[PDB]
Design a protein around this ligand. Structure first.
Ligand SMILES: N[C@@H](Cn1cc(F)c(=O)[nH]c1=O)C(=O)O
Ligand SMILES: N[C@@H](Cn1cc(F)c(=O)[nH]c1=O)C(=O)O
Lengths: 260, 260
């Protein structure tokens, strides 16, 4: 057997650099939900692995011109990594080029506001212009709006794509910082999982409002045809049935929440 | 190509006999969420199909002695059906013998009470003996309790397995009838999806209480190695992304709710 190369992404609380990572090496440098999940998956599948952070820091999109896949999806497609264990959304376009395990976490697009912002829904956002709003500049959330045929979401996309200055951000942390520093004049559309995590982090000035706009899941990905796919899929189901996934979410989201 | 034999189960509001089914034939005899889903899946995969109701009316379990699979899972395993489109829970033991598409619906085990019953959680149920409680006599809900290592659920299982008279029911309708006629002395543990549906049906005397005990999903199943598996999986993802699955749930659960 050969050491399995795992690609993942620095996104809290899935994968984060330990405070004393400098005095550590290898897999011990990282911590988080996906770090713990990788260990469990490897144990149940019987393989040794090496955690690596995706080179370009992206999730995975295909350039329409070059037809090249970037991010974690690209690392799997081109053979740079053997498996991706991260908050990677299971989508049709990705499923066509890589394999996904059954979902290990459920989520949906949601709204994050600075406390006090007079917004309760996506409809509210679409009907006004005072408060700007956007999404991560790349990823399944942005694609949801770009492709949506639903009236409200179509209206939101039409506004966001031409908004000036840009309402799109490079990372979740940037979106959160923008919400926190815009005095309620910026609302952020992001995956509910990240939203829920941030709501329990100091300075406790943000909140998730309304229901989710959609429902989907994160899955563990492997190059299509990979001999690891079957075992990884069964391991995810086993971990869910044993309640381990629920335990891990509580560990990284709520057990040490900072907002009471 | 050959007509695809679809196996499903009579479970409201997934598959139900039309009021005037007697004057109809073939697939037109049935209606419901899964009937509509089957039509969408068939359209997107390009196949003609025949809806059939599982012979033994079961979901799918393996007899420990004969090693024989019953229910819809069995029909796929033994080649009696080509695909199962129903509220079939994706589980490890089943995934080992048949293939499952990514989930088309999310759910979790939940508690159904007759309005007014002094119960708010699974913990509440486990700490008392006045109110009896049980599950469907076979299926993923019962297995959840039988296998759970979680204190509260283990305590509940220990009670349910030896309770007299039996707290297990043959069908969802039986569990609901038992809740409605037991004057609050019987609480029913069932999948949240069914619970949510019943709560919006007359006589509007039941209610879902507390959060779900777990989180999982329903998937479309095919015999392992089936040439239909890949297309069906992509179709589920496409239908979810296009918002069709959400539309179908609203259609069969809430659009015509009978409880205001
Ligand atoms: N999980 C997404 C990436 N991703 C992450 C986020 F935190 C978010 O808010 N939106 C998003 O699309 C993907 O796989 O593209
Ligand atoms: N979906 C389950 C069957 N099933 C159905 C129910 F309505 C319920 O409450 N519990 C259950 O296990 C399976 O696939 O076994």
């Amino acid at each position: 057997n050969k050491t399995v190369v795992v690609t993942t992404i620095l996104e809290s609380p899935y994968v984060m650099m330990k405070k004393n990572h400098e005095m550590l090496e290898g897999n011990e440098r990282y911590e988080g939900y996906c770090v713990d999940l990788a260990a469990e998956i490897a144990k149940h599948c019987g393989f040794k692995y090496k955690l690596t952070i995706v080179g370009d820091g992206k999730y995975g999109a295909r350039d329409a011109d070059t037809k090249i896949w970037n991010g974690m999806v690209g690392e799997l497609v081109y053979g740079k990594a053997d498996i991706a264990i991260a908050p990677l959304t299971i989508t049709l376009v990705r499923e066509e080029v890589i394999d996904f395990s059954k979902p290990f976490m459920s989520l949906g697009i949601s709204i994050m506001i600075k406390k006090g912002t007079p917004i309760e829904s996506a409809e509210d956002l679409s009907k006004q212009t005072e408060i700007a709003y956007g999404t991560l500049d790349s990823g399944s959330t942005k694609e949801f709006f770009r492709r949506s045929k639903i009236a409200v979401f179509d209206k939101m996309w039409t506004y966001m794509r031409s908004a000036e200055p840009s309402v799109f951000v490079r990372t979740t942390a940037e979106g959160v910082a923008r919400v926190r520093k815009s005095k309620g004049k910026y609302a952020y559309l992001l995956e509910s999982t990240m939203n829920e995590y941030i709501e329990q982090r100091k300075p406790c000035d943000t909140m998730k409002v309304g229901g989710n706009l959609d429902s989907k899941g994160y899955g563990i990905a492997t190059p299509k045809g990979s001999s690891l796919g079957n075992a990884v899929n069964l391991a995810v189901l086993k971990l869910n049935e044993q309640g381990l996934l629920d335990k891990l979410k509580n560990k990284w989201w709520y057990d040490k929440g900072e907002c009471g």
